[PDB]
Design a protein around this motif. Structure first.
Motif, PDB file in Angstrom:
ATOM      1  N   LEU A 173       0.827  -1.200   0.000  1.00  0.00           N
ATOM      2  CA  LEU A 173       0.000   0.000   0.000  1.00  0.00           C
ATOM      3  C   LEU A 173       0.864   1.254   0.000  1.00  0.00           C
ATOM      4  N   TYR A 174       0.872   1.969  -1.119  1.00  0.00           N
ATOM      5  CA  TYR A 174       1.652   3.193  -1.222  1.00  0.00           C
ATOM      6  C   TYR A 174       0.779   4.407  -0.914  1.00  0.00           C
ATOM      7  N   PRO A 175       0.774   4.858   0.350  1.00  0.00           N
ATOM      8  CA  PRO A 175      -0.015   6.010   0.779  1.00  0.00           C
ATOM      9  C   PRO A 175       0.365   7.267   0.035  1.00  0.00           C
ATOM     10  N   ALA A 176      -0.453   8.289   0.177  1.00  0.00           N
ATOM     11  CA  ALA A 176      -0.161   9.559  -0.449  1.00  0.00           C
ATOM     12  C   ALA A 176       0.693  10.387   0.491  1.00  0.00           C
ATOM     13  N   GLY A 177       1.804   9.788   0.895  1.00  0.00           N
ATOM     14  CA  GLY A 177       2.726  10.437   1.800  1.00  0.00           C
ATOM     15  C   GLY A 177       3.843   9.505   2.218  1.00  0.00           C
ATOM     16  N   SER A 203      -5.293 -11.234   1.121  1.00  0.00           N
ATOM     17  CA  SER A 203      -6.308 -12.192   1.536  1.00  0.00           C
ATOM     18  C   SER A 203      -7.518 -12.112   0.614  1.00  0.00           C
ATOM     19  N   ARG A 204      -8.541 -12.903   0.911  1.00  0.00           N
ATOM     20  CA  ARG A 204      -9.752 -12.912   0.102  1.00  0.00           C
ATOM     21  C   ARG A 204     -10.892 -12.203   0.827  1.00  0.00           C
ATOM     22  N   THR A 205     -10.635 -10.977   1.275  1.00  0.00           N
ATOM     23  CA  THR A 205     -11.650 -10.205   1.984  1.00  0.00           C
ATOM     24  C   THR A 205     -11.555  -8.719   1.650  1.00  0.00           C
ATOM     25  N   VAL A 206     -12.691  -8.137   1.286  1.00  0.00           N
ATOM     26  CA  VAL A 206     -12.761  -6.723   0.935  1.00  0.00           C
ATOM     27  C   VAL A 206     -12.810  -5.837   2.178  1.00  0.00           C
ATOM     28  N   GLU A 207     -13.385  -6.364   3.250  1.00  0.00           N
ATOM     29  CA  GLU A 207     -13.509  -5.621   4.498  1.00  0.00           C
ATOM     30  C   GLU A 207     -12.139  -5.283   5.060  1.00  0.00           C
ATOM     31  N   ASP A 208     -11.203  -6.200   4.874  1.00  0.00           N
ATOM     32  CA  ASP A 208      -9.845  -6.000   5.350  1.00  0.00           C
ATOM     33  C   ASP A 208      -9.139  -4.989   4.467  1.00  0.00           C
ATOM     34  N   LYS A 225      -3.067   7.003   4.350  1.00  0.00           N
ATOM     35  CA  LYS A 225      -3.030   8.279   5.049  1.00  0.00           C
ATOM     36  C   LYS A 225      -4.368   8.956   4.875  1.00  0.00           C
ATOM     37  N   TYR A 226      -4.952   8.725   3.710  1.00  0.00           N
ATOM     38  CA  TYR A 226      -6.243   9.270   3.380  1.00  0.00           C
ATOM     39  C   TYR A 226      -7.316   8.630   4.258  1.00  0.00           C
ATOM     40  N   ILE A 229     -10.652  -2.320   2.913  1.00  0.00           N
ATOM     41  CA  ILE A 229     -11.105  -1.003   3.311  1.00  0.00           C
ATOM     42  C   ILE A 229     -10.305  -0.548   4.527  1.00  0.00           C
ATOM     43  N   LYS A 230     -10.282  -1.396   5.554  1.00  0.00           N
ATOM     44  CA  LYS A 230      -9.526  -1.106   6.760  1.00  0.00           C
ATOM     45  C   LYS A 230      -8.042  -1.053   6.438  1.00  0.00           C
ATOM     46  N   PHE A 231      -7.674  -1.651   5.309  1.00  0.00           N
ATOM     47  CA  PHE A 231      -6.296  -1.677   4.878  1.00  0.00           C
ATOM     48  C   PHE A 231      -5.815  -0.277   4.562  1.00  0.00           C
TER      49      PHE A 231
END
Length: 121
Positions: free
Chosen positions: A87-91, A102-107, A117-118, A109-111
């Motif tokens: 995950l390359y944040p905007a900072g 993993s195979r989860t979208v919920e993770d 940073k956003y 979002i929280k990811f």
């Protein structure tokens, strides 16, 4: 103007992953994968649903879901675990959040929401 075409998630190859996934314009979630990786094939549903929603909801100009072929594109970073989810944040494009995926979208979002940073969540 024009919006939509093919594939929501921006599959950025190692060639542009430094231009799209390494862009500080927004939080980019890169999911290294392969064409024969049964794992990615299960992670795509979230990448198309999340990626699409991320690229067509209320963050299309914000945190974007990116991808890259770790076996089709020579990346500058090493990968001990295939696939991977950086995950390359905007900072913090220098110390992204390298992951296994993993195979989860919920993770997800929280990811980018805990890793990003956003805080896209």
């Amino acid at each position: 103007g024009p919006l939509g075409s093919e594939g929501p998630v921006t599959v950025v190859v190692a060639k542009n992953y430094n231009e799209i996934v390494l862009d500080d314009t927004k939080d980019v979630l890169i999911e290294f994968y392969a064409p024969w990786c049964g794992h990615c094939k299960a992670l795509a549903p979230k990448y198309e649903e999340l990626g699409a929603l991320y690229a067509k909801s209320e963050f299309k100009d914000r945190v974007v879901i990116a991808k890259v072929d770790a076996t089709a594109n020579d990346v500058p970073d090493e990968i001990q675990g295939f696939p991977t989810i950086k995950l390359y944040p905007a900072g913090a494009k220098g110390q992204p959040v390298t992951y296994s995926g993993s195979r989860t979208v919920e993770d997800l979002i929280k990811f980018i929401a805990e890793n990003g940073k956003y805080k896209a969540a």
